[PDB]
Design a protein around this ligand. Structure first.
Ligand SMILES: Nc1nc2c(ncn2[C@@H]2O[C@H](COP(=O)(O)OP(=O)(O)OP(=O)(O)O)[C@@H](O)[C@H]2O)c(=O)[nH]1
Ligand SMILES: Nc1nc2c(ncn2[C@@H]2O[C@H](COP(=O)(O)OP(=O)(O)OP(=O)(O)O)[C@@H](O)[C@H]2O)c(=O)[nH]1
Ligand SMILES: [Ca+2]
Ligand SMILES: [Ca+2]
Ligand SMILES: [Cl-]
Ligand SMILES: [Mg+2]
Ligand SMILES: [Mg+2]
Lengths: 440, 423, 61
C-alpha cells in the first residue's frame, strides 16, 4: 500500500527505466517472465515490493510503470527485449513523429495529440492502487519529448491528482554525449514550467556520470548503457527505502521533509559510493567509513558543483547492505571534524541516516563490482545553483541573438515564454542566494 | 517509418541523383534489380527511409525523375540500376528549356508540374510518416533550376509542415561555357532562401579545383565531378539511413544546423581526397582544400557544424581530436552558440575506404560564394544583356532586381552574424 | 481543513486555466504562422498567373 507509479518520458527516461526495472527485478528475485518464486501471496499482497509491482492471478509481477515516447524505435526495443513480457502492451505508449529536440513540439504540436491517451493509461494504473502515494517521472532536460511533453504531463497530472506528490529524475545535459545545440533552451523552458508542479527533483549531470565512468571504471568512452547502469544504482538507493522495509529503514518521504525547506528549493544533490571496478574491488573491501568519506568528495556527485563554496540545508545518508549504526556514527564524527560542512544558520546540522539491509545488486556483465555495502547521500546545498548558472549562461548567449528561436515560434510559442522562463530561473538563482545568507 | 521522398530534376539533377542511388544501393546490399544480397542486418533496419517494399521482397527507390527533355530519361533508364526505378515515376517533357529559368519556372514547366505533383502525392500518400523531401538539381540550367524551385514552391503548398531539402549545384565558368548561368543561379537562390530548410551548396568551381589540383586530373569530366558529389551525398545521409542517435531526422538536423531560417546554405566537405590516422582525417576535413563550396572557412566564422566519421575507429580518439581542433580554431566558431559542433560515428565503412569523414558546415564564409554569383550577375544586368530571353516569357526586369537585392541581403546577413560578439 | 481544501482547488483551477490559455494561444499562433506562409505561396501563383498572361499579350505584336 502507498504505491508509486513510475513514468518514463523520452529516450533518456525510457532507457534509464530499462536499467532501473532490470535492476529492481534482480534485487527482488523477479524473473524476466514476471514470476517471483519467493512470493507466496499469489495475485496480490501488501509487501514492500508491491509498492512498485502489481501482481496478476497468474503470478506475474508487473511494474507500476508507464513508458511514453513520441517515436517508437526506443520503446520498440523494450517490446522485443529481454523483459518484453514484464509489461502489459498498454503500458508502452508510442507516437509516430518525435519532437525534434523542440520543446514546443513535445508540449504543444505533437504532445497534444497523445496526452489524453497517456493520462488514460496512467489512470488505469492508479485505479489498481489502494493508497497511491505519488509519481516518479524519469526524463531528460534536453530532448524535445523529455522537456516539452514532460512539462505538459506534469501540468495535467497536477490537475487530475491535485497535489499528490510528483518526483522527477531529470537528465541534465552534458556536451560529451549531448544531442542538440538548443538543449539550454529546452532545459530552461521545462524547468520553469514544472517548477510549480514538482515536489522534489533529483538532477543527474551527464558530465558527472561521464567523468565517474571514465575515472572510476576505466571506461575510455562511456556509452548510454554505462551511464544508465550507474544511474539505476543511484535511483535504486533512493527508492530502496520504498521497496524494502526493515528496522532501520527510513521512508523517502521522511528524508524529503528535511530536504525541502521552501517549495522552490527542492533540488537535492546526490552523491554515491563506492563506484569501483571488480578488478579493483578484489581484496579491497570498502568500509563504512571509506564510502562515507567518498560522499563528500565532489568527484562522486551526480551534478558537477562545489559544496565547499556553498552552504548546507540538509544532509541525508541512505546506506544499504552490511551497515550498523555504530560504524555510521563513528564515520560521521570523523567527517565532521575533518571536512568543510557549513550549514545555513537557520537549520540543524545533524545528519539523517537510514539503512536497508538488502545489499546492492549488480546486473550481469556490468562494469561495477558487487559490494557488501553502498551509500547515497542526499544533500540540500546552495551549490546546486551552479548548475542553473552554467545553463542560464548558455541560454543567454544564444537568446541574445534569437539564435534558433524561430524553430520554436514556428510551432506556436511566443518570445514571452522565453523571457518569462529565463526570469523564473533568475529568481531561482536569487532564491538560492537568499537561503544561504546569515540571519539578523 | 520516417520516409524521405527523393526528386531529381534536369540533367544535372537526374544524373547526380542516379549516381546517388547507385552508391547507397550498394551500401545497403541492393542489386540493380532491387533484390537484397547483404551481409548485415543493419543495412535494412532503416532501408524504408529511401526505399519502398514491394511484392517479392523487392526494394524500390522512393524517387521521381523529372526533366523537360526526354534525352536524360532514356539515359537514366539504360544506365546501371536503371530498371530498379518505378516506371510510372518518370515524368519527362518533350522540348526542353534551353537553359532558361523562366521557361522552367513560369511556362513550360508549369504545364508539366501538375503531372509531377501527382506522382509526388502518391508516393507521399503511401508513407507511414513522411518527414520531407530532398531535391537534386543544378542552379545554372533551365529545367532543374527554374522548375525545381517551382516544384519546391508547389510542394510546400501541399506539405507546409514537412522538411524541404536540396542538393543544389552552383554554376561556374570553369565547367559550363553557357553565359546566362549567373542569371539562373541568382533567380534560384531568391526562391531557395524562402522555401527551403536546408541547401547543400555543391559548387562546380570547387569540384573542378579539387579534380585538377588535388586529384591531379587534367581536363576533368562530369563523371570525375560527380564521383565527388556521390561521396558527399552518401556521407550526409549516413545518419538518416543507419541507426545513429545524432541527426537521424531531417528537421532534428535542421534544428541543430539552422540558427536563423534564411541562413540554411551549407558547405559540404569530404576526406580523404586521393587517387589514414584519425588526427589527419579531422584536420584534413577542416581544410579549405577539402570543401565542396569554393570558400575559405578561415575568411569567416562557423555558426554550426556537423562532422560524420565512417569506419571502425577509436571514439576516444575521435572525441579528443574533434575537441582539439575547436580549441586551436576557436576564433572561427561564433562564441554566442555554445557547443555548436556535433559529431556522429557510423560503424559502417564506405566503399573502397577503411575510414572516411563528411563535413557539413554553416559558415558565414559562404558569402564568398554568393558574392561571386552576384558579381557574374551584375556584370550582365548593368548591360541588360540576354534579358530578352526572359522578358519573352512574361517576366519583368525588376524581378531581377528583387532577386539581386535579396541575395545581396543574404550576404550582408552572413556578415551581420560574422561580426557579432557576445559581450 | 476548509482552507486546505480551498487552496488545493484553486491550484487545480489556476493550473487548468493557464494550461487551457496556452494551448489555445498556441493553436492561434501556429495556425497564423502557417496561414501567412500559404498566403505567400498563393501570392507567387497570382504573380505566376499574371506573368503567363503578360506573355500572350506580346505575342500579338
Ligand atoms: N544518461 C542518459 N541521457 C540521455 C540518454 N539519451 C538521451 N539523453 C539525454 O537527452 C538528450 C537528448 O534528448 P533525448 O532524451 O534523447 O530525446 P527525447 O527526450 O526522446 O525527445 P526527442 O527525441 O527530441 O523527441 C541528451 O542531450 C542527453 O543529455 C541516455 O540514454 N542516457
Ligand atoms: N558536376 C556535374 N554537373 C553537371 C552535370 N551535368 C550537368 N551539370 C551542370 O548542369 C548545369 C546546366 O544545366 P543542365 O545540366 O543542362 O540541366 P537543365 O536545367 O535540364 O538544362 P536544360 O534542360 O538544357 O535547360 C551546369 O551548371 C552544369 O555544370 C554533370 O554530369 N556533373
Ligand atoms: Ca504477493
Ligand atoms: Ca565538362
Ligand atoms: Cl517544418
Ligand atoms: Mg526521441
Ligand atoms: Mg537539359
Amino acid at each position: 500500500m502507498r504505491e508509486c507509479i513510475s513514468i518514463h518520458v523520452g529516450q533518456a527516461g525510457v532507457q534509464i527505466g530499462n536499467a532501473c526495472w532490470e535492476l529492481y527485478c534482480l534485487e527482488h528475485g523477479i524473473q524476466p517472465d514476471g514470476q517471483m518464486p519467493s512470493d507466496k501471496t499469489i495475485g496480490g499482497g501488501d509487501d514492500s515490493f508491491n509498492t512498485f509491482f502489481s501482481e496478476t492471478g497468474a503470478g506475474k509481477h508487473v511494474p507500476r510503470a508507464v513508458f511514453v515516447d513520441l517515436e517508437p524505435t526506443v520503446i520498440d526495443e523494450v517490446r522485443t527485449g529481454t523483459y518484453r513480457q514484464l509489461f502489459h502492451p498498454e503500458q508502452l505508449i508510442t507516437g509516430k513523429e518525435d519532437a525534434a529536440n523542440n520543446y514546443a513540439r513535445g508540449h504543444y504540436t505533437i504532445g497534444k495529440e497523445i496526452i489524453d491517451l497517456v493520462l488514460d493509461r496512467i489512470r488505469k494504473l492508479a485505479d489498481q492502487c489502494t493508497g497511491l502515494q505519488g509519481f516518479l517521472v524519469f526524463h531528460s532536460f534536453g530532448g524535445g519529448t523529455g522537456s516539452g511533453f514532460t512539462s505538459l504531463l506534469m501540468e495535467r497530472l497536477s490537475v487530475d491528482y491535485g497535489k499528490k506528490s510528483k518526483l522527477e529524475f531529470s537528465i541534465y545535459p552534458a556536451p560529451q554525449v549531448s544531442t542538440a545545440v538548443v538543449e539550454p533552451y529546452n532545459s530552461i523552458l521545462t524547468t520553469h514550467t514544472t517548477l510549480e508542479h514538482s515536489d522534489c527533483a533529483f538532477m543527474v549531470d551527464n558530465e558527472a556520470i561521464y567523468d565517474i565512468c571514465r575515472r572510476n571504471l576505466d571506461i575510455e568512452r562511456p556509452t548510454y548503457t554505462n551511464l544508465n547502469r550507474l544511474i539505476s544504482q543511484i535511483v535504486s538507493s533512493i527508492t530502496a527505502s520504498l521497496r524494502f522495509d526493515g528496522a532501520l529503514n527510513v521512508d523517502l518521504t521522511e528524508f524529503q521533509t528535511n530536504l525541502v525547506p521552501y517549495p522552490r528549493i527542492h533540488f537535492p544533490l546526490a552523491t554515491y559510493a563506492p563506484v569501483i571496478s571488480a578488478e579493483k574491488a578484489y581484496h579491497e573491501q570498502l568500509s563504512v567509513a571509506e564510502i562515507t568519506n567518498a560522499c563528500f568528495e565532489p568527484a562522486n556527485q551526480m551534478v558537477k558543483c562545489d559544496p565547499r563554496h556553498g552552504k548546507y540545508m540538509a544532509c541525508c545518508l541512505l546506506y544499504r547492505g552490511d551497515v550498523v549504526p555504530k560504524d555510521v556514527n563513528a564515520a560521521i564524527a570523523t567527517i565532521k571534524t575533518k571536512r568543510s560542512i557549513q550549514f545555513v544558520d537557520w537549520c540543524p546540522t545533524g545528519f539523517k541516516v537510514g539503512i536497508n539491509y538488502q545489499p546492492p545488486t549488480v546486473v550481469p556483465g556490468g562494469d561495477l563490482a558487487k559490494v557488501q555495502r553502498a551509500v547515497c547521500m542526499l544533500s540540500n546545498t546552495t551549490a546546486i545553483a551552479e548548475a542553473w548558472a552554467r545553463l542560464d549562461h548558455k541560454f543567454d548567449l544564444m537568446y541574445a541573438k534569437r539564435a534558433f528561436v524561430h524553430w520554436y515560434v514556428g510551432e506556436g510559442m511566443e518570445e514571452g515564454e522565453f523571457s518569462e522562463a529565463r526570469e523564473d530561473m533568475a529568481a531561482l538563482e536569487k532564491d538560492y542566494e537568499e537561503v544561504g545568507v546569515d540571519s539578523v | 517509418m520516417r520516409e524521405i521522398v527523393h526528386i531529381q530534376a534536369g540533367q544535372c539533377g537526374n544524373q547526380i541523383g542516379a549516381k546517388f542511388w547507385e552508391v547507397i544501393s550498394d551500401e545497403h546490399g541492393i542489386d540493380p534489380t532491387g533484390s537484397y544480397h547483404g551481409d548485415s542486418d543493419l543495412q535494412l533496419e532503416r532501408i524504408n527511409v529511401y526505399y519502398n517494399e514491394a511484392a517479392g521482397n523487392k526494394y524500390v527507390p522512393r524517387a521521381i525523375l523529372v526533366d523537360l527533355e526526354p534525352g536524360t530519361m532514356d539515359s537514366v533508364r539504360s544506365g546501371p540500376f536503371g530498371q530498379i526505378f518505378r516506371p510510372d515515376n518518370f515524368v519527362f517533357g518533350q522540348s526542353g528549356a534551353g537553359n532558361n529559368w523562366a521557361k522552367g519556372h513560369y511556362t513550360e514547366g508549369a504545364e508539366l508540374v501538375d503531372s509531377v505533383l501527382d506522382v509526388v502525392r502518391k508516393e507521399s500518400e503511401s508513407c507511414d510518416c513522411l518527414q520531407g523531401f530532398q531535391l537534386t538539381h543544378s542552379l545554372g540550367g533551365g529545367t532543374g533550376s527554374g522548375m525545381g524551385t517551382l516544384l519546391i514552391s508547389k510542394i510546400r503548398e501541399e506539405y507546409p509542415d514537412r522538411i524541404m531539402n536540396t542538393f543544389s549545384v552552383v554554376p561556374s565558368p570553369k565547367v559550363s561555357d553557357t553565359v546566362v548561368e549567373p542569371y539562373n543561379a541568382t533567380l534560384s537562390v531568391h526562391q531557395l532562401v524562402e522555401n527551403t530548410d536546408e541547401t547543400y551548396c555543391i559548387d562546380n568551381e570547387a569540384l573542378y579545383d579539387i579534380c585538377f589540383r588535388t586529384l591531379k586530373l587534367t581536363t576533368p569530366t562530369y563523371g570525375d565531378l560527380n564521383h565527388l558529389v556521390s561521396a558527399t551525398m552518401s556521407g550526409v545521409t549516413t545518419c538518416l539511413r543507419f541507426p545513429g542517435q545524432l541527426n537521424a531526422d531531417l528537421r532534428k538536423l535542421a534544428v541543430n544546423m539552422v540558427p536563423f531560417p534564411r541562413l540554411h546554405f551549407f558547405m559540404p566537405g569530404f576526406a580523404p581526397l586521393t587517387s589514414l590516422t584519425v588526427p589527419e582525417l579531422t584536420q584534413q576535413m577542416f581544410d579549405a582544400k577539402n570543401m565542396m563550396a569554393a570558400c575559405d572557412p578561415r575568411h569567416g566564422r562557423y555558426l554550426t557544424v556537423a562532422a560524420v566519421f565512417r569506419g571502425r575507429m577509436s571514439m576516444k580518439e575521435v572525441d579528443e581530436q574533434m575537441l582539439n581542433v575547436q580549441n586551436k580554431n576557436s576564433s572561427y566558431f561564433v562564441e554566442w552558440i555554445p557547443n555548436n559542433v556535433k559529431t556522429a560515428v557510423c560503424d559502417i565503412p564506405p566503399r573502397g575506404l577503411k575510414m572516411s569523414a563528411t563535413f557539413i558546415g554553416n559558415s558565414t564564409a559562404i558569402q564568398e560564394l554568393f558574392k561571386r554569383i552576384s558579381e557574374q550577375f551584375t556584370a550582365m544586368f548593368r548591360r541588360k544583356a540576354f534579358l530578352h530571353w526572359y522578358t519573352g516569357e512574361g517576366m519583368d526586369e525588376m524581378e531581377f532586381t528583387e532577386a539581386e537585392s535579396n541575395m545581396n541581403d543574404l550576404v550582408s546577413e552572413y556578415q551581420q552574424y560574422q561580426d557579432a560578439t557576445a559581450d | 481543513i476548509q482552507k486546505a481544501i480551498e487552496e488545493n482547488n484553486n491550484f487545480i483551477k489556476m493550473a487548468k486555466e493557464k494550461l487551457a490559455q496556452k494551448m489555445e494561444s498556441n493553436k492561434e499562433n501556429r495556425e497564423a504562422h502557417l496561414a501567412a506562409m500559404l498566403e505567400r505561396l498563393q501570392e507567387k501563383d497570382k504573380h505566376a498567373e499574371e506573368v503567363r498572361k503578360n506573355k500572350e499579350l506580346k505575342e500579338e505584336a
